[PDB]
Amino acid sequence: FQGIRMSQILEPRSEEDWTAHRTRIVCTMGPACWNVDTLVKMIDAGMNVCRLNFSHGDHETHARTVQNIQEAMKQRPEARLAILLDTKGPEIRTGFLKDHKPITLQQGATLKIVTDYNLIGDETTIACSYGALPQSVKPGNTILIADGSLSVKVVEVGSDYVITQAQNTATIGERKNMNLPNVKVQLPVIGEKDKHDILNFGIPMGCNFIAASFVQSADDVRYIRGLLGPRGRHIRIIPKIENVEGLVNFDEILAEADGIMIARGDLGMEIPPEKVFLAQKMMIAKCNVVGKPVITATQMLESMIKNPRPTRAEAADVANAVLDGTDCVMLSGETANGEFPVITVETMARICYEAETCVDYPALYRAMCLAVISTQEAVARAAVETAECVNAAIILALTETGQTARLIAKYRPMQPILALSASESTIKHLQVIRGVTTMQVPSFQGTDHVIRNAIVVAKERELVTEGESIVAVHGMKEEVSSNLLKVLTVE
Amino acid sequence: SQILEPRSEEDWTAHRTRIVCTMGPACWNVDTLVKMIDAGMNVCRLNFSHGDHETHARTVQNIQEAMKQRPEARLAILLDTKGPEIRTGFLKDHKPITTLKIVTDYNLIGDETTIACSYGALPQSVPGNTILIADGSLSVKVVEVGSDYVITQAQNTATIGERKNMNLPNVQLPVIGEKDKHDILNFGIPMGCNFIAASFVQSADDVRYIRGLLGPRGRHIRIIPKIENVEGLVNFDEILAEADGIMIARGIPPEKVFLAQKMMIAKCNVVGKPVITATQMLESMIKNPRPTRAEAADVANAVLDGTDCVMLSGETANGEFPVITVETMARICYEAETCVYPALYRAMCISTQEAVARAAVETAECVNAAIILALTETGQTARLIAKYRPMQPILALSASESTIKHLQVIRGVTTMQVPSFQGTDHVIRNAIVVAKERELVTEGESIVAVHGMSNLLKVLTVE
Amino acid sequence: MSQILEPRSEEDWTAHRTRIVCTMGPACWNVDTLVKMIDAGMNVCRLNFSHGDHETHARTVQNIQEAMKQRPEARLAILLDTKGPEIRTGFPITLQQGATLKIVTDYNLIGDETTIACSYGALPQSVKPGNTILIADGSLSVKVVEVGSDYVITQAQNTATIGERKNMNLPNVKVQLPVIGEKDKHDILNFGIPMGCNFIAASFVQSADDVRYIRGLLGPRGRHIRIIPKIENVEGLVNFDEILAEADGIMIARGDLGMEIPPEKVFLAQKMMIAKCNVVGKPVITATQMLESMIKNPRPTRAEAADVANAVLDGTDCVMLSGETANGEFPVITVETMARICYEAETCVDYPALYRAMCLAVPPPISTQEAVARAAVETAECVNAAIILALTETGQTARLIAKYRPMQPILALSASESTIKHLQVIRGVTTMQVPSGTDHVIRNAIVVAKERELVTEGESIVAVHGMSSNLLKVLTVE
Amino acid sequence: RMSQILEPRSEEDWTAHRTRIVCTMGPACWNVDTLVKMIDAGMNVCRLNFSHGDHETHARTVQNIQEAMKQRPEARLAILLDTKGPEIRTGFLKDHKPITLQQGATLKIVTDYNLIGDETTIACSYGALPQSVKPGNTILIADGSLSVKVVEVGSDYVITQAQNTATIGERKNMNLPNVKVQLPVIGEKDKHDILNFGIPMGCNFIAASFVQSADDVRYIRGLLGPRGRHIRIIPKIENVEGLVNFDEILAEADGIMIARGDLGMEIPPEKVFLAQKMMIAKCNVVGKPVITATQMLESMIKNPRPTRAEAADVANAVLDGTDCVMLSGETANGEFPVITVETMARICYEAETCVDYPALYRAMCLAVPISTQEAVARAAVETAECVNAAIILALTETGQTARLIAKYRPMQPILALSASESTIKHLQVIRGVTTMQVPSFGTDHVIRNAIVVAKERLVTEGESIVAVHGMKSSNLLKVLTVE
């Protein structure tokens, strides 16, 4: 920065400013936002996507939640919130402790971890739910227990047990989660429960995305796609990257997927903490280059579960994800179990807006040109260039499959993108794309007509004014092709 | 390395630079005009320094006949005025010559003894005066003034050619006289001339005057000032602003004349107005079936400077090898264009129309399009695309007969006549099919289409 | 990805470019711990004059000199961090949300639930209806409703219970107290100068006049001492460019700023201040809220590691540890992991893009000496140089090179002790003190560099030497 | 720039052109006073054309050069020996009377060089003509005034058909487009000239006519040996074989002369400009001097002004990036040898104002991994722009430092300082370099003496200078501010 004055960043933003941020916001449903009234307030605040966390709840309880989303949307007929099912997936847990009493292990003390899950544990020996532990872990390996509370180094392996040594002093309760840094977990990513949730809830309840916890290989993604079948053709797959296997297989996972969710907090249980930030950056960049949405999740605004303001570090952490290039930022417990769900959504919208203040759009556009072509991409690229060249107020992306909108968004134009589509599922899928807002349009509508309608609607809503330039892009037969770019003036 | 590759006819006939040929007794007959079409002629120049309306009408009707044998061709016709010229006549065997008599009778085939003068009032405009001939190379002193002749003594030992300029100190002629006015009004308009090339233009007033003379009856005629003197060079900016294009002739040291050609071409380029380099290109080919190295290099540097058109004068008008000359001009242009494409686009660097024309040229490159289609009614879309010098052919589609003739002067564009079909997408579909039937595109190939006004760029692939 | 997942050796993370400031305290100030801290990455020792007496900081200094005996190649800089202006409440009371609280200028008044005393006598002059007043580390927030000549009436925004004589903050407001009080004056003149402190980190700097006053205070006897204003409030931020122009360098105090500014704007303020320090080549220190959890835990959190790395990616010269080293259970481990995070962070710095960005960002005209520094950076790149040598008396040559952020280590050779120590805050620089012609100074530095494995036979070196005229030399190691 | 076309270039201006001018010696600039005037006009190199004259005759010329330099002690002229090399000629004709061939006429060409020729038949001096050529080959006669197409080949004759109408005389030159001439590039005559004149007479360059192979360069260098170490070889590229083998020829060479007139007799005229541009750019990239030669200002043999076309051709060579431009008949055999050098210098000055210098350095970095010495040279050019320096000083013993700076084409003058007299001579061929001979010694001392003279003749107190030094091994670059 030079010639730009410090007092500039100290202007308060108006509702009109921060609600027009480009980054998309994902909110986890829960008791704190159980009722229709707060869901509506969350829409106004910036909510674009509703996450159903299937680690808890059942088909009945999540049905009530869905019914409430549908009611909120009746009060806001212009909002087309997407619904994301987030699977439970594989889990490793410690077993039970004598008298349910927590145990404290001392640094350098010996802990046996056994495979018999009936074993009632004590300070010296505990049970682990993962039967293949002794055949997964080797001497020198690290095992984390209770959200990384306790760290043990593996000293010896038997057939049905492992001898470990505490790396720190800690107090652990019973049935705590376990992590196996640098070790593949030999458990199905999509178990029978997950399969039931995808097929018997996700499909008939109108979920638009599946976020699949703990994806370890691209075969996991191919598996969900075949599971989804023709009846689930309108559902997009968002693998969650949570360990080393996910990281090591990232490129093949990304290629098979419709987008990525980066679970930082889980990744920090599986690799040195000082490397998670590198991984995030790398994974966002790779998603960007290929034009697929990336969600940044976990450890976002966690203090707001209890406080009406986030910490400095938290605001910075969210802002840097935006600057890394993230499509979405995600709230978890802050909205599910928080004292300030709507205030948390407004706050993240504000942090997004301020980070987007930092974005160099010419240098992002040219960075994508040096990193990446087809007819569709060339025209999307020409559109962004031309929009900038003629000082256009907005870019119209006319789109059936979403491709056209995504290709333009990929180039991070300074101008807002209005994606126009007759397809309901496409409009929903687009709620996950930075820089895009959405308008559903009737079927069998001519190109010019659709463009005419969008501009006059925009002019009535005081988004564009008489005389400003507009850039419209029409991808035709998007994934089977012919591509248009029109420049027109608001009358 | 691939410098030494001989050129197939398919290759060099695809040259982008336009070729203007001067009509003359050596080439005006239907049979040789057809062979000239085949070799690369795009524009026919009628030089009104010579001959009458009857002569020039015969030339025009022959052009029409030639076009009936080559229906796909759309030769433009340029009228080049006489203007205030005072030039020497033709010499024996077209050979340059090394006590001299200058005559008013321009039928004289001159020699060392006596030469002719294009200015019929030369005797009344000079018994002791001085006359400079061939840009001040020969200087003569008038000994005697007769009725229709002058006797001079060569006050300098020098060698002079034919059709060379003559200055007369202590003697002023209008840019457009009554004879020029008559030619423009009574031939230019009724004979279907598309261009007026106005000799010795000196200011933008000259341009506006011709535009005033042309009026509504000549609205379809475009004006090309010739910059031939210092005044026209001094007023070039104003002249270009009013003009439709520019013609650079020879007629400040030569150490500085080379700067003038570069400056004037570059300025025409920037503004997308066509420029014709008409600077005595391949003069040896009046007598020889082959150019010299220096002549070939002279044309090539014109093309590299960015000229839209190169022009043949005596080489086609009074030459022994008119068809072969056009051919070797097509061949030179092609080699020069060979080393001319991402450089000119980034070196050219606005309105919506130009923003889209520029975007279309970039997409074409990016997508590796076979051709760029320029849907145009006034020619402007085609011109705006062309000024970006794309690597791919520009095919211009127009319902406007006169627009299609004006376009013959634009480097990089071929034309195709399209019915006034109120539908852009229909016109593109229809035109692609004829491009196939011309083998300019094949199935699978990419095309970029442009229409200006609502400005449009469309990328499709040929079925 | 797995290039990212390469488990780093001690040899790797010990070569990090970013400098590390550690705060001295009872947890670390013993000779043996200080030694382990040098090996871990510590480059600068901060003496926090907010606490302790001249005796405590003197023995600390003495312990640092002894540690340097165990490490002769190490040259630690010492930074005196001032107490500076303070506001304090008078003489524990709970007040619930919405309750009226009076704050008075009569400091001899013993307080209660309704009326409390303030040490800041010009409080009415500074504050107005609307302003917020923070008490006891921002634990209580009150809003001013009306102002009298010797009192202020406020409304509590949260329920809190406050103790006796706690701090106060005045968001968005200039505090009219001397930035260097008589106490700070004594600390600078009667400790800073005689104990050989190299930097003064001046707390709560609010204007360019504060910086000029300090340098005037230092005078010719403190010529060798550089001034690092601390940016801790809105007044400091608003006055940033004029403060920076007078300053030798800048310390960013995020936590403090977080008291006066919405959290969602502090990150912006950090970015901008670092960027401005870079473009002008003056060192910047990122302080507070670094690896705070490591006061009690042997490992940092994911979010803490990320926060540190982002400071590095923003362009910070130094990162600074506070309570982590001064009072923590793992002072040595904290430095090592700080060093480790810096290494990972510098692992994704685009050095061609940083040099290009800087070359386009810097305003003209650039000087002879800045032109040669640029040239050395580009030459180093074309030639695939292993290191850049900077022969410098004042430190300018080294600083100008470092601001262009070369891939290669910069080894700065100087005969000036103060210069060697000032360079400890400069990202990418390593120092070697020398006594006094270019030739055998260069030859000897190559020997040491070769043995340190920074260069091997047949590789190229770039040596730069300012003195006014500038030299740039490329040689082959032999 | 319209005012650049109008305002007349003042004396001091054109005198400072960057391009080097090579002048051919002969009767028209025979005497010392004319050569002295040519020095003032901008002559940098004197070419001796060994196609004519002998060792006595060319020795007189050198004496007159040595003497002209005594009147201009600051001038250091390079002398260049241009070999005759191999030649092909027609034979004699009945009654010595020239013959006129009509287009389409058949002409037999025989190998018996004793045959007195006819309208119907002539001899050729090249005995291997029929084995060199086949049906379809073109043969050019008398500077290409007559072209004939080969129709039939025998053991000792070829049958041809004229492609045009021409009249030709006796003993006229002949060219064989796209055919290797199997005659020594360095014959016994050429070897004698190189060893027995070139070396002992102090020539600085050999321009080898008609180089077809890199072996020709190696042969010449073998010839010169230890005794001719100080002599640099400039192959002349004149036919298809020189073009095919150009990269190899340039790799061995110290520089290149482009003989355009000759090339236009060997390849289509419309391909010569390509060849010229290509050859200059390649020389530029690798930092070796290139001379553009023949058909430069020919009309000035008889006229006090050149043609529009000629001027533009010289200018475009300068813009192509030529280091030197050469005059032949214009100074050897013309009426205006001084005026020709002069107008050549002014043409060079004017074309160099069109040069986009920052674009040249940018294009040079992308085209040319690169060494330590070239890195410091490039860093000097960049720093000079950056700092707005008056001059670049290049301290050099072999010339290498000066040549590496000059290939980056800085906007500022390069003042090269050397203790080596022959290096100073070699540098007469490098664009943008001026030369000062220095005593045989510290290097910070030589710079002070060069700043205390530039003040007299360039820089003024307070201006920035960039100095550069090599070891051609370490390299240095100083930026200092004039006293």
Numbering used by the authors:
A (entry chain C): 36 to 407, 411 to 518, 521 to 531
B (entry chain B): 42 to 139, 145 to 172, 174 to 218, 221 to 300, 306 to 394, 396 to 404, 411 to 514, 522 to 531
C (entry chain A): 41 to 131, 137 to 481, 484 to 514, 521 to 531
D (entry chain D): 40 to 407, 410 to 482, 484 to 499, 501 to 515, 521 to 531
Paper text:
During glycolysis, pyruvate kinase (PK) catalyzes the irreversible phosphorylation of ADP at the expense of phosphoenolpyruvate (PEP), yielding pyruvate and ATP. Previous characterization of cytoplasmic T. gondii pyruvate kinase (TgPK1), using either parasite extracts or a recombinant purified enzyme, indicated that this enzyme was allosterically activated by glucose 6-phosphate (G6P), which enhanced its activity under PEP unsaturated conditions. We solved the structure of two different constructs of TgPK1: the full-length enzyme (Met1 to Glu531 plus its N-terminal 6×His tag), which crystallized in the absence of substrates, effectors or added ions (“full TgPK1”); and an N-terminal truncated version starting at position Ile39 (“truncated TgPK1”). In both crystals, the asymmetric unit is composed of a tetramer with imperfect D2 symmetry.
Crystals of the truncated TgPK1 were grown in the presence of K+, Mg2+ and a potential inhibitor, although no evidence for this compound was found in the electron density. Conversely, in the truncated TgPK1 structure all of the B domains were visible in the electron density, with one monomer remarkably displaying a closed conformation for this domain. This large structural rearrangement involving a rigid body motion of the B domain resulted in a maximum displacement of nearly 20 Å. Steric hindrance effects would prevent the binding of the nucleotide to this conformation; consequently we defined it as inactive. Two hinge bending motion regions were identified containing two conserved Pro residues, P125 and P216, at which point the B domain pivots towards the A domain by rotating ∼68°, generating a 77% closed conformation compared to the open conformation. Finally, a disordered region was exclusively associated with the closing of the AB cleft in the truncated TgPK1, the Gly300 to Ile306 loop. In the disordered conformation, additional electron density was observed and modeled as a sulfate molecule binding three side chain hydroxyl groups of residues Thr437, Thr439 and Thr442. In the new conformation present in the truncated TgPK1, when the Lys515-Ser522 is ordered, the carboxylate group of Glu516 occupies the position of the sulfate group.
